[PDB]
């Protein structure tokens, strides 16, 4: 059980290190063949689309994905859990916070290896206006947010 | 091997990591009951010279926090010494805040913890947050520097003043 | 077992951040091997004496947090190579800001039952639109401190090949 927790930590680390090094093949490889990444409600399903998403991401983003606060429950070859996500971005005005939120994950151990079946990212909203996109409020950041959202719209479907 | 004494200490460390994660994930989803449940029944949280003691006051603090904050508490760099059913350690705290101007850093500092294991579960007996200050003017609270940020800081310090008591040192 | 080594490496990474962030330069240099090195911004600082001096210079001008997360290490006996994410906050008169965002690229060695850093390179994240730009000096509040850190590196280290 403890070893599985360390394996899941390693998976989360590889998810960040692959996307942050523009390794879209490796990023998609963190998911099951038919796995999904959901953000801002758009569900991007399957390695082919996931790889396209990472490629689009690579064109417009440099920064760090930080995954911390990992809390997973494992039963046999399935696990679910949550973790905190903070994403930085390199801008001409310095390093800014592109994203802050929570991953909600369903993981599957298939033939020896943990992979992401479903990862939902929920980004934090204003307490007083859960309609406002906080990630577009700063202008440097806003253009990048636009590109990522556009990629999700071209590659996913909204539920 | 096998499992040796220090190996057992590492399994306790993973358990403590999970407690730290729970602490963050509960407050960040406005689960004040879950948050207070990370502490012992007479556990305390200290920040800025104020100590909030006991689950009921801790629950009220979380509820006050929920009214004014959306953001993430990140806890990283965990380093704990386990001695049977007690542990002491430190970890890094960075706290983000969703603002009308974008995501900002609300807080940065260190947790200094005293933990107790009861009924097979680790909980926080005492957690002290020390926030990072200006090297040049350590009197200044750095949280109050940005105006969005500063209002949230004021609300949290007010909750602490209503729910806690001032430290003796 | 490989997994206990990973936890030990995690604790070394934690110690690195907690020492520097509490102005414990001896402690910080003690995370490295005796002739271990730290590389950043094209400068390499080598050996505990110089690393201690670096940490002391750092303490004079920085208050903030080094976060290390996303740790991924390959352990082969008493050596390991790996990567982790670095985000560094800084207390400024305009609030907390991000001083650094990048990747640590590490070569670790285990001796006397303890892992230490033989070589750590910090590679900060670059602008996609212009890799020549030093993003850590784009914000004036942050650049002020970077300048002091680079002065210490210039005094204590050697430029890379």
Automatic annotation (TrEMBL), chain B:
Residue ranges annotated for the SnoaL-like domain, each copy included: 14-128
Pfam families xrefs: SnoaL_4
SUPFAM superfamilies hit by this protein: NTF2-like
CDD domains hit by this protein: NTF2_like (cd00531)
Name of protein: SnoaL-like domain-containing protein
Automatic annotation (TrEMBL), chain C:
Residue ranges occupied by any SnoaL-like domain in the UniProt entry: 7-121
Pfam family, one: SnoaL_4
Domain of life (superkingdom): Bacteria
InterPro entries given in the database record: NTF2-like_dom_sf, SnoaL-like
Protein name from the UniProt record: SnoaL-like domain-containing protein
Species, as recorded: Mycobacterium tuberculosis (strain CDC 1551 / Oshkosh)
